[PDB]
Amino acid sequence: ANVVVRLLIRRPECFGPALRGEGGNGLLAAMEEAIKIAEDPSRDGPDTIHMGNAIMTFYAALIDLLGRCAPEMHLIHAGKGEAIRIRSILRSLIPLGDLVGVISIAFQMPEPDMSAGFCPDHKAAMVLFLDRVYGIEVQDFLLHLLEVGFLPDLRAAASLDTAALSX
Amino acid sequence: IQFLRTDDEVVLQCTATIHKEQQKLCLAAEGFGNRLCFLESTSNSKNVPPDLSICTFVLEQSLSVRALQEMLANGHRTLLYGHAILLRHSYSGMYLCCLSTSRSSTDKLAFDVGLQEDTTGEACWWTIHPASKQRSEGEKVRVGDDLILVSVSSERYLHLSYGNSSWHVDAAFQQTLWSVAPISSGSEAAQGYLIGGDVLRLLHGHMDECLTVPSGEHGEEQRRTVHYEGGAVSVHARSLWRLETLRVAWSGSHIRWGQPFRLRHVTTGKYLSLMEDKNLLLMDKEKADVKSTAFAFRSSKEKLDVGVRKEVDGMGTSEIKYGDSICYIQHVDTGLWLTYQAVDVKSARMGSIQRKAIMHHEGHMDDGLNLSRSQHEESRTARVIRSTVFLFNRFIRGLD
């Protein structure tokens, strides 16, 4: 994990251009535009590679890699200094509000439609990154996150009778 | 071949190639009033001089990263590649460190670099690495080597970020050249002898006067005038001068006869300048020409030698005393010499006793310039006075 962070910071171009660069802001606008690419067929092969879905999977994989690259479950992080250093590096490199906005998108719940778009597994990487990098000991933070990015998805999951489309 | 041994004054420069032109920019820190660092242009020094006083750093400790972490979890050395150094600013006395806030919006991940008083923490330490394959870790660093510094805390590179007006150095992930120019090697600085970059003043053998300017009761146009004054002015803030040498390397060496350097008024920040239509006055840094503002000291009255010394790379020879060293000011362009006048007519002779300075060929054979260094305490007091009057005047104008 440590050498992975060292190499990724030595070559910053490994990160997506919308995150890393003097250009794009971050994951929020990146995934807004990704949803736009998935919706608009002018940006694909006229089974084709959905460019928006590809961007979404790349960013989700990067977030999951960073989250699993987070120092620890705070076993050694309590007494270590290098672990705190790596965790601070991860925090300062990925804004928290960006992650909150990414989680709070509230994808639709569908007759079937296509899963080559904003898949529910994309937010799993964000949840893992939050759990392993930032964590939850703050009451109003937990309540705000639940109110904004968790309740709509919970309601969408619960409002199911027969049309079992996405497990 | 000279090694960088600890307890020496150094200057951290870098080379920037922007807009298809090359510039040499130094690392500077004001110290009092603000914490963040900025840039001083040693290049283009022919009309705008660089403030070498606030660009000087001293290396306190040179330990391994590992010995550093042992000390954290708890003697003239030689610098080795791969160690971690502690850069204390020469003037302010604080320490260079990696900050936690960011001002340049162009870098959302980089950190700023500034000064802090406390040595506790990994922010104030900078590990040192070579910039060439011929030099590896564990090697001694010579003068002029291509060095690069990484923050121990954030593991971020001492990057020279670029902006339209945001010319900062930040803690980024892209490397940038950093060269170390020696100033004072930390060797035996001969006590009682003049050293480059000092803040001192001049006195007379049988007059007890100093070359000063009018006090703050008048406007700065009136303060631009230069004269001699005695009495309580012997120990004041406006009676101090700084010898700013043109060279950026070994500027804090022993100053010798005939070499050129500017005289800076610490209280006002202006330099002594001459146009032939008038006498010498004080003017700001935006037009400080080398030929207009360069001077020297001679040990006699003749013109036997002018262009005899060109450059000496090192501490130099310890020649000029302070007490028993009768120096004579000589301009590099006109070769005119100091003279005291009697402008105050007999009608006002009993009042304010000021005898103006006119720089002339002949002079009087009674000058006897005896040098006297001002202590670090009042030199710092004078320069912080200059900084605070500048800031307060800016605030006053902005609010008015």
Curated annotation (Swiss-Prot), chain A:
Summary of subunit composition and partner proteins: Homotetramer. Can also form heterotetramers with RYR1 and RYR3. Interacts with CALM and S100A1; these interactions regulate channel activity. Identified in a complex composed of RYR2, FKBP1B, PKA catalytic subunit, PRKAR2A, AKAP6, and the protein phosphatases PP2A and PP1. Interacts directly with FKBP1B, PKA, PP1 and PP2A. Interacts with FKBP1A and FKBP1B; these interactions may stabilize the channel in its closed state and prevent Ca(2+) leaks. Interacts with SELENON. Identified in a complex, composed of FSD2, CMYA5 and RYR2.
Record function comment: Cytosolic calcium-activated calcium channel that mediates the release of Ca(2+) from the sarcoplasmic reticulum into the cytosol and thereby plays a key role in triggering cardiac muscle contraction. Aberrant channel activation can lead to cardiac arrhythmia. In cardiac myocytes, calcium release is triggered by increased Ca(2+) cytosolic levels due to activation of the L-type calcium channel CACNA1C. The calcium channel activity is modulated by formation of heterotetramers with RYR3. Required for cellular calcium ion homeostasis. Required for embryonic heart development.
Taxonomic lineage: Eukaryota, Metazoa, Chordata, Craniata, Vertebrata
Family: Belongs to the ryanodine receptor (TC 1.A.3.1) family. RYR2 subfamily.
Location within or outside the cell: Sarcoplasmic reticulum membrane
Tissue: Highly expressed in heart, lung, cerebellum and brain. Detected at lower levels in adrenal gland, stomach, thymus, esophagus and ovary.
Post-translational modification (record): Channel activity is modulated by phosphorylation. Phosphorylation is increased in failing heart, leading to calcium leaks and increased cytoplasmic Ca(2+) levels.
Domain notes: The calcium release channel activity resides in the C-terminal region while the remaining part of the protein resides in the cytoplasm.
UniProt name for this protein: Ryanodine receptor 2
UniProt source species: Mus musculus (Mouse)
Disruption phenotype: Embryonically lethal. Embryos die at about 10 dpc, due to defects in heart tube development. Cardiac myotubes display enlarged rough endoplasmic reticulum and cytoplasmic vesicles that contain high levels of Ca(2+).
